[PDB]
Amino acid sequence: NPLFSPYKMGKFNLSHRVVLAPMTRCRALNNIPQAALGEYYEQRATAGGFLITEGTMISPTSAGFPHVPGIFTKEQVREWKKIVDVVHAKGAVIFCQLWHVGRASHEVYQPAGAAPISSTEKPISNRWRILMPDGTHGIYPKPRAIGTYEISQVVEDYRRSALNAIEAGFDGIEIHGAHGYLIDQFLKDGINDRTDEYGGSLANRCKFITQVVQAVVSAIGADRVGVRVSPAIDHLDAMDSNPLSLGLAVVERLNKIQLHSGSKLAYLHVTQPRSEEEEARLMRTLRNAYQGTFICSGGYTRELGIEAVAQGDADLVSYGRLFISNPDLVMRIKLNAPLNKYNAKTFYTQDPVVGYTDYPFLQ
Ligand X SMILES: Cc1cc2nc3c(=O)[nH]c(=O)nc-3n(C[C@H](O)[C@H](O)[C@H](O)COP(=O)(O)O)c2cc1C
Ligand Y SMILES: NC(=O)c1ccc[n+]([C@@H]2O[C@H](COP(=O)([O-])OP(=O)(O)OC[C@H]3O[C@@H](n4cnc5c(N)ncnc54)[C@H](OP(=O)(O)O)[C@@H]3O)[C@@H](O)[C@H]2O)c1
Q: Which residue ranges make up the annotated binding site for substrate?
A: 176-179, 274
3-state secondary structure of 125: coil
Per the residue annotation, which of 181, 267, 290, 359 is the catalytic one?
181
Is 124 exposed, middle or buried (CB count within 10 Å of its CB: 0-12, 13-18, 19+)?
A: buried
Identify whether the C-beta of residue 91 lies closer than 8 Å to the C-beta of residue 46: yes
Residue 271 binding: pick among ligand X, ligand Y, none (C-beta 5-8 Å cut-off by kind): ligand X
> Would you count residue 69 as binding ligand X (CB under 6 A)?
no
Stretch touching ligand X by CB under 6 A, among 5-13, 100-108, 150-158, 295-303: 295-303
Contact letters (x/-) for ligand Y, 239-278, by CB under 6 A?
Answer: -----------------x---x------------------
The answer to whether 181 is a known catalytic residue is yes
3-state secondary structure of 347: coil
Residue 320 binding: pick among ligand Y, ligand X, none (C-beta 5-8 Å cut-off by kind): ligand X
> Would you count residue 321 as binding ligand X (CB under 6 A)?
yes
Stretch touching ligand X by CB under 6 A, among 161-169, 217-225, 296-304, 308-316: 296-304
| Complex with ligand X: residue 31 or 199, whichever CB lies closer | 31
Is 123 exposed, middle or buried (CB count within 10 Å of its CB: 0-12, 13-18, 19+)?
A: middle
- Strand positions, DSSP E, the chain: 7-9, 12-14, 18-20, 50-57, 93-99, 117-118, 130-131, 137-138, 144-145, 172-177, 225-229, 267-271, 294-297, 316-319
CA–CA gap between residue 176 and residue 56 (Å, rounded): 9
| Complex with ligand Y: residue 260 or 274, whichever CB lies closer | 260
Rounded CA Rg of the chain:
19
- Number of residues located near ligand Y, criterion CB under 6 A: 3
CA–CA gap between residue 344 and residue 59 (Å, rounded): 28
Choose among 3, 51, 95, 21: nearest CA to 321: 21
Stretch touching ligand X by CB under 6 A, among 204-212, 233-241, 249-257, 298-306: 298-306
Instruction: Enumerate residues 182-201 that contact ligand X by CB under 6 A.
Output: none
- Shortest Å distance, C-beta 48 to ligand X: 20
Annotated binding site for FMN: which residue ranges?
22-24, 55, 97, 228, 299, 320-321
Residue from 9, 14, 18, 23 touching ligand X (CB under 6 A): that is: 23
Contact letters (x/-) for ligand X, 149-178, by CB under 6 A?
Answer: ---------------------------x-x
CA–CA gap between residue 328 and residue 337 (Å, rounded): 10
In sign, the C-alpha dihedral spanning 319, 325, 331, 333 is negative
- List residues near ligand X by CB under 6 A: 21-24, 54-55, 97, 99, 176, 178, 228, 271, 297-300, 319-322, 347
Active site residues: 181
- List residues near ligand Y by CB under 6 A: 214, 256, 260
